[PDB]
């Protein structure tokens, strides 16, 4: 099974996952200087107010926080997309140190960590039907920026004691994943894949321009997390951050530039 040690990293994904090295890989440096304006981009349209939370899962490659994806209760729509996005959950990417943790960057530049609330077009009958095709996703990235202390985030954090180690949950009701947002939703977009594998070409990015805030002392628990299950030796959770791929011949556009 893959993973992000020296041996199942991303350096050795490739090789069970050939697409590693595909036309459409992320995540990406994004410069600035680079990006371009696009008259038929659409300000982001997050309805995010019926979300329904299920659970908080330990996966074993990080924390998922899943939604209830059955109706229209929780979606994206306009930016760069046609059509309704539904959301199904959101997962975090984090560093070893403060310094590091962000897979996309902007102009080189890392962020403790990085926020991916996953959506999947509805013109396909469910989450796993949508992957599989180039307009299937749309994953929303949010940068956390070193700072003061979140109390939106401190909510997920609080639960973290609960998942410590590989397939376990728990419950997780009532969180509204708008309070993980910025108050600006300027962004960027790209085509791209999810950043693990199977790392599936199907994504639309929309990476926010703003981050979001995190503290020093909140950082520290994403690192306390196993990616072992309960039984197994200790491996701490101290990094699942995918580096950025070559670009090649995408272009990064902006908005509202
Ligand atoms: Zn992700």
Same mark, same amino acid.
Request: avoid cysteine; glycine fraction near 0%.
């Given at each position: 099974h893959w993973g992000y040690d020296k041996h199942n990293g991303p350096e050795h994904w490739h090789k069970d996952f050939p697409i590693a090295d595909g036309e459409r890989q992320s995540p990406v440096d994004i410069d600035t200087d680079a990006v371009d304006q696009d008259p038929a981009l659409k300000p982001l349209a997050l309805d995010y107010g019926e979300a329904t939370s299920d659970r908080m899962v330990n996966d074993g490659h990080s924390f998922? $926080?899943?939604?209830?994806?059955?109706?229209?209760?929780? $979606?994206l729509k306009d930016g760069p997309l046609t059509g309704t996005y539904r959301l199904v959950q959101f997962h975090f990417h984090w560093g070893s140190s403060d310094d590091q943790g962000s897979e996309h960057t902007v102009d080189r530049k890392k962020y403790a960590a990085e926020l991916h609330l996953v959506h999947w077009n509805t013109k396909y009958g469910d989450f796993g039907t949508a992957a599989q095709e180039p307009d299937g996703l749309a994953v929303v990235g949010v940068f956390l920026k070193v700072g003061d202390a979140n109390p939106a985030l401190q909510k997920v954090l609080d639960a973290l004691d609960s998942i410590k180690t590989e397939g376990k949950s728990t419950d997780f009701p009532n969180f509204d994943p708008g309070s993980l947002l910025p108050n600006v939703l300027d962004y960027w977009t790209y085509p791209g894949s999810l950043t693990t594998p199977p790392l599936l070409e199907s994504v639309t990015w929309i990476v926010l321009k703003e981050p979001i805030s995190v503290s020093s002392q909140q950082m520290l628990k994403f690192r306390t997390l196993n990616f072992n299950a309960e039984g197994e030796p200790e491996?701490?959770?101290?990094?699942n951050w995918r580096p950025a791929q070559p670009l090649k011949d995408r272009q990064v556009r902006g908005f509202p530039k």
């Open positions: 998922n $926080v899943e939604y209830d994806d059955s109706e229209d209760k929780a $979606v491996e701490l959770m101290l990094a």
